[PDB]
Amino acid sequence: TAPPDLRVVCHRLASTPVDSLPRLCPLLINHVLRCGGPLSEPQTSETAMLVHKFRTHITSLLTGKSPAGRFTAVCLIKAVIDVGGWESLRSAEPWIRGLIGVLQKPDPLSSKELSIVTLTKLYILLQDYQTLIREMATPTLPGYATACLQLIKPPASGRPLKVPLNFVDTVAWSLSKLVVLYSTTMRPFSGQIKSALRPYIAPTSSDNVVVPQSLKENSRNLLILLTYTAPKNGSSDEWVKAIRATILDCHTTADQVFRAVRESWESTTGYHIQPVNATGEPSGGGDSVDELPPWSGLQAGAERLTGLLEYLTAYFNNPTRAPVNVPLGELLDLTTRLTLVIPPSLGAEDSIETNPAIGRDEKAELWSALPDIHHAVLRLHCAIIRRLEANAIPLATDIIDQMVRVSTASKQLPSVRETAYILAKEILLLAGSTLPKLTVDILIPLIQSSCHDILTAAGHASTASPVSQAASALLPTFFTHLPQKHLPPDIRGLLDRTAILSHNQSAMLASCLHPYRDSRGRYYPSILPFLVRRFPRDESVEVLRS
Amino acid sequence: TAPPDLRVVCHRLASTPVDSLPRLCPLLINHVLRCGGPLSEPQTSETAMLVHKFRTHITSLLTGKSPAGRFTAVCLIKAVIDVGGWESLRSAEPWIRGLIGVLQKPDPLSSKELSIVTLTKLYILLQDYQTLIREMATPTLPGYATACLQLIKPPASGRPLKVPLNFVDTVAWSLSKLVVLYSTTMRPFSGQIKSALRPYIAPTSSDNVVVPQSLKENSRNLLILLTYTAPKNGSSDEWVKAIRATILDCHTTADQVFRAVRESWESTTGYHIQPVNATGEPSGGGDSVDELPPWSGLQAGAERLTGLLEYLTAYFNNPTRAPVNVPLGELLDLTTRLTLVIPPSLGAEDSIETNPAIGRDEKAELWSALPDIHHAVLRLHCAIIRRLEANAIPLATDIIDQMVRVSTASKQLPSVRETAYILAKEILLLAGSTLPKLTVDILIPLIQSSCHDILTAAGHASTASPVSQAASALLPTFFTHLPQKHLPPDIRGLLDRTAILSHNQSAMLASCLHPYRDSRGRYYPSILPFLVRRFPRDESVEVLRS
Amino acid sequence: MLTEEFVSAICGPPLSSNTAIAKDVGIYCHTLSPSYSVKSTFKKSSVPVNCLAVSDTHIFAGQHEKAYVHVYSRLRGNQEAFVALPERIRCLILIGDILVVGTTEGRLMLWEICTGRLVSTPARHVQAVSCVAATPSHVLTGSDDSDIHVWSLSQLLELDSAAEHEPLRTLANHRAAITALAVSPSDSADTNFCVSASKDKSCIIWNYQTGDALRTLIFPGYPLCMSLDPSSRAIFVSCEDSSLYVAEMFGEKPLLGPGSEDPSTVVQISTPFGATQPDVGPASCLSVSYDGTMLLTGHPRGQIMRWDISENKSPVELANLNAAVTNLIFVSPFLTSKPTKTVNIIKPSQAERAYTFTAQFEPMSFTKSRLDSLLNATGFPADALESAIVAFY
Amino acid sequence: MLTEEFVSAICGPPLSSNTAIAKDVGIYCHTLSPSYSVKSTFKKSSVPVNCLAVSDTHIFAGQHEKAYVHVYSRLRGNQEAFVALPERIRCLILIGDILVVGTTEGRLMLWEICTGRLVSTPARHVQAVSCVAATPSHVLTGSDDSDIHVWSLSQLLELDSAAEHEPLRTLANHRAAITALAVSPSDSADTNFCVSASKDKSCIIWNYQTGDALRTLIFPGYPLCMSLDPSSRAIFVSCEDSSLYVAEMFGEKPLLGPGSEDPSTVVQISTPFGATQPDVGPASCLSVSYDGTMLLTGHPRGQIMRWDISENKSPVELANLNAAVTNLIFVSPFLTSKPTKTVNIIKPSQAERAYTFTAQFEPMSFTKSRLDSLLNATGFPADALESAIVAFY
């Protein structure tokens, strides 16, 4: 006798009209995920008969002309490939051709997105078995890539995108997996993918279109992962050339951004700031393949610089096929150049050296636009730390100096402060324990700001805030990974009060495990009573009770 | 001199065309969030002049006929009320009338949603000051409620809903806050809100419309929070009557669901199972106000029972204005009745007593539909535990018996297992430490299943799964909050191996702090070397190093 | 950096006439930190030792030679209820929302404040239950028969049982009436301990789930009232000789731990932390503040005296209540979050009814949505705003 | 429940002829658990003691009386590189992706495997650096001048520093050449300790960041090689008298902790855990398995001996390599997750260039999207499927 789930599936597939099937898709998916075992059996028992009729119904739903039926078949194929295994993968070939045909046919775009996800899952699952790669993936894949590139190609000369940018995000997400898996098959399409993904790498205000963040992230991911398709093992060279071109593009945009301010910065690597015309607004970019789309205006230039910095972040986010040379010195010099330019404090506008030919409005726009560039620089430093781990220790002093200068210049923005807290946690986790006294002294205002934000959120000096959560995460690190001997007693008392009033178990525990010894050589009292009173039965106090 | 941000805001608002302003909204919002201080100043300096021009331009954008201008004004009003404080709140009255006018005008629905969010934030912020409540909130609020109820009212006799269900979700979310804040003003609209939210409480397959989960959750939340508007302090009585009516509705649907199975259950409270006609499919519901919409079919009845159980969960999720009587005995009897009916294992179909007049297909559909009802029961138990905390201790034995019976009946379903793990963690956190031997013995297969799921995810016996994450969270609780003396040595060894191979710090730490002593009266070796080798510098081992 | 408050209770007749104190008041509420003051008073109460329990909403008071419990509302500021119990009360405490009551007959009852159940155990103790302590998992009752019975909360509280209840364990190394009971905040089997004192001038630290006796201490006078420090590192003990004693369990020689001696050995504590002049009298109630640096004692002659544990200075008298002070309960300065609130109590009724729970449900943000993230964010989030602009065009 | 592997290294000429062992092999790879076997061998290597470092991808070997480092690839299975260093090498270890090398001249260098930098310190040690141990924050070098210099990694590794480097501290209580160095996994200032051994038959446990000497131990023979247990609870010490000694830091009387004596007092370890017959010889290299239950020793006569720490039985001989065994390094059975993989090394060049880092970036799921949640879920998630059906109609 068959399991109840399979015969329920057969009866509901036979009885239901095709147009109401998408509404019954959740229960059908639940039932077919339940009966994975009958489909896993290699192909008379009633179970095998019902499995054969079920697969016949799936094929008839897929091949038949009904958008509701095609949608239902897409969902059923996804669930069946999820639960069946090798036996379903053996017969998935007419299903693969059917899903590509669904993408070719004019259907609702959610059905196309689900077909894209199902085909991506099919290729990832077919990667295990080489014979099925030869039979299925290699012939069907160029047609799928052509069908996707047909959708996301911009006919911008005649008309704008009939495909929404979320669907472009979906296609870029699928191709990001497939360039990693099948490099040689996806190699002919790289020139088309680059031209399709050119506008979404660093959008500006002059582009006059709103680009979703996920579209930019997946566009950058796909252009970085396109180095896998480089012929004759040229992946690393293409990666190095691309990242160095991005660094040079950052520098050239930074020239036109910092036209208003005389720059004392001189390059370690050997970059030279070209003369910039004082007449007119800053401008740049171009229609060339190597150049990003043109921009005009100081805010658009700041947006382009921020997008280029996010592209450099996405370089460290994505993996590489072969070992690559990472120009840490060039990135360090670039970030030093961008962080050296700081906006004046109130009443200190005349202190900063500026070109007299620049108008006051451009100066005001530059002072407004600087913290976003600084925030992108700090996020780039965070990604560099996350990828390098212990190899980012030699950059710690320069990243500390940049972070202190940025957080001092833009102290009144909560977002810059939050990014500074997130960066400072990783900095102290790497190289905070062995810092000299002067580094601790310049780090002191950041500790004061973080404690003030935590106490403001707790209301002891209110609702939770992302800057408050970042500072609360930073708070145990000030005890664990900072030299207590370099801290003044006022800072330690502020840290202890912040830990107590914040009810932070980790910070209170870290203050208990790292006592502070002052000049008189006698330890201050521990905050253990507060920790045991607030968290009596927690696991950390249980470890203390060992 | 003015701050740069405010002058940039004024220049960009003056120069930009109105239709391109929604694309410039993110930078405008960032700049106006930057200059909160000039707007916070109580109202010649250039700062005050630019603030006055900025507010005048916001008012001109809002009152003028431009959907892009109205959208931009909505965003600017939200940010200005966020950063200005009392000085913006005292003048937000033409802004409040303008936002209600935006809701009345035919505009894009995202602008309407943003106006709804902005008006909700305005009312929540106006709640602090009583004079502004008398001047602003009380007159303007019935118009806003009428404008929302005009949108979400179904003209189902004439046409289906012109408004998408996500917008109905938005309106229900806003009214959920406003019934809590302003009970007396929102009191006349409760009869309309109930009629509008009737279809979304327990949708079935017979309704032939797909209801988003957030719509059901916020509909249940709003109908529970509508008890705040009860006159003459009648909130608690309405709450008790509503929850008891829901329990009776669960029982009446359970009769028509379990018509196929002879039930040995007898009620503690005094409910009696009415005779059910064996002929035809099960059916129920009605068009009455007290009754939920009609259903027909066993799967639709199971969906109705699941929706009613989720409604009972939402009862414990939402707060109450006054102390209420919670019928824990009736809910316990109802859950006992639903969990007593279990589907047979393979080869044991004839063991379960069934009515001979029922067809075999209906029996198959019932066996398929039982695990979802059981999962809803377990989620109801989780919500009851979460709300009651230590007051749920008397129900612990019955919830343990129900959980063991459900997880044994539906062992092959990962979702039922995941919900059982989540319930078991809370059960053991409440009353696991003092369990008798027989309860531990019946809990043993759940421990075996959780360890098997963790080891399958780790691959030592693969990608992370929600059932795997639930079992990994449950894993330290088996050491901390379960009697180790009642566990057999095989179960303890399996737990230790699972903790080691899972690389879970918390379970290894808990096994270190809770040693196992066998019948031979000497302790097993600890797993501390694995913990120190895998996590050398973590904080818990640092506490161990005290 | 904080304000700290405590609740006092007096008993008996007023000691001195013409002192201008109110004769009707029996319960006071004070502010210990920053400066001494009195917030509010409660009238018509006479509470013996160990019969006062304080929650965030209610104060429960056991009456002298009288089976009633007076329940006062801290929110409204008046007396809420006159609860009647079957037998006269020697001691009562409050765990969660359950009042645990010992009697002269030796019975134990648990009265659930919200549901109105009165779970009454058989009289396992031969004589009066003198002290009660509780955990989330166990309830420990010390009586006049020198037996400390350890009971499971889960077996007592659970519903469908009609059989008689039994204790899990009995700790009977004491040979006289149990005067005090204090329990460590740990509920784990290995790391927990309970500290008990008896009339035979003996104080035993037990592992109550295993039943073993970890440590034995001997005092020159029998212990009246006891309290552990918030770190669970020290014990403060008042005695009949008008003195306060401190015991460091992790000091030079640890009482408990790797450096401790054999559990069969006996440690004698003879150095007083402080002494009290006999016109003030031996301290009848003993409480420790939240920080643990500073301590409070109540005396039968009316004086409430503050001791500096860290400074080790002489005690200073806060006020003279002109009546025998029996209870001092500290209230935590920080407020905890509990998903329910007990506005009103439910009196115990023996009538058969369905199990009902009565409390006010509190806003706890259990329901989360993306619209809440839109609302609570300053301005609008970038991705949600981008989706809004895409939906607009 | 696991398989465990270790890497051996030999030195000198083959001891016995006609034993049919390969004469050209210098490095072996074995499987200790479940059963003894040999996976692969590496050719043409002669490694003295403390000159072998093993990573997941490469094996670095210092050559006897020769300034070159032979780098072998564990992935490809062959010799990768013949690295040339300025001075002859006494010892080298590997921390992260940095090879830390001590010399006969007393200098210390750090060679970054990925970037090719060679940071060379001034010769602070008067004579040869004999042992090197590492911390993620510090580097400890013991030399023949009895001074253990504690250095900061951050000051050595940083780019723009052109001044000469200096040690943070010098630990000089020893009066002879430092033979061995062990570092506790704790990196905190208060809880860390480093264990050092010298030729004056002394073994000092220090707190190297404070510079204090926590404990002093005296052995009958001077310590050759030392290894700490995985729990950091015991020390295993080999000596010149062909015996192995075990010292428990948290045993009956703790060497470190609350129950310990004064740090100026001296503890003498005189009871051998085991002894070795002199035809086998004293153990020259010492390693502890992942579980810590079993231990491995290498001997100058070729025998690799496995010791049962828990069982305390007689040692058994795994194999005779017919050459003096100088290094045994255990490889962790579980594989750790690292964002970068070092496929190839970069040889140190003194030429001026921009700072470049060379590694292969590994898939780490740093980029997360909702489409990934759609893909990895079995079937489709309920809310995403509901939104799909709404978008369909």
Author numbering:
A (entry chain CW), B (entry chain CV): 2 to 44, 52 to 469, 512 to 596
C (entry chain CT), D (entry chain CU): 1 to 393
Please give the exact wording used by the authors of the publication that reports this structure.
Since the Rix1‐Ipi3‐Ipi1 complex is known to exhibit a large hollow sphere with a diameter of ~9 nm in yeast (Barrio‐Garcia et al, 2016; Kater et al, 2020) and the reconstituted ct Las1‐Grc3 heterodimer a butterfly‐like structure of 13 nm × 7 nm (Pillon et al, 2017), we conclude that we can observe the entire rixosome by electron microscopy. Once again, we observed the spherical density, which we attribute to the Rix1‐complex, and the butterfly‐shaped Las1‐Grc3, both arranged in such a way that the shorter edge of Las1‐Grc3 is preferentially oriented toward the Rix1 complex, with a distance of about 35 Å. The hollow sphere‐like structure is formed by two copies each of Rix1 and Ipi3. The Rix1 complex from C. thermophilum exhibits a highly similar structural organization when compared to the structures described in S. cerevisiae and human. Strikingly, AF2 multimer predicted with high consistency an interaction between the Las1‐CC and an intertwined bundle of two CC α‐helices formed by the two C‐termini of Ipi3.
The rixosome defined in Schizosaccharomyces pombe and humans performs diverse roles in pre‐ribosomal RNA processing and gene silencing. Here, we isolate and describe the conserved rixosome from Chaetomium thermophilum, which consists of two sub‐modules, the sphere‐like Rix1‐Ipi3‐Ipi1 and the butterfly‐like Las1‐Grc3 complex, connected by a flexible linker. The Rix1 complex of the rixosome utilizes Sda1 as landing platform on nucleoplasmic pre‐60S particles to wedge between the 5S rRNA tip and L1‐stalk, thereby facilitating the 180° rotation of the immature 5S RNP towards its mature conformation. Upon rixosome positioning, the other sub‐module with Las1 endonuclease and Grc3 polynucleotide‐kinase can reach a strategic position at the pre‐60S foot to cleave and 5′ phosphorylate the nearby ITS2 pre‐rRNA.
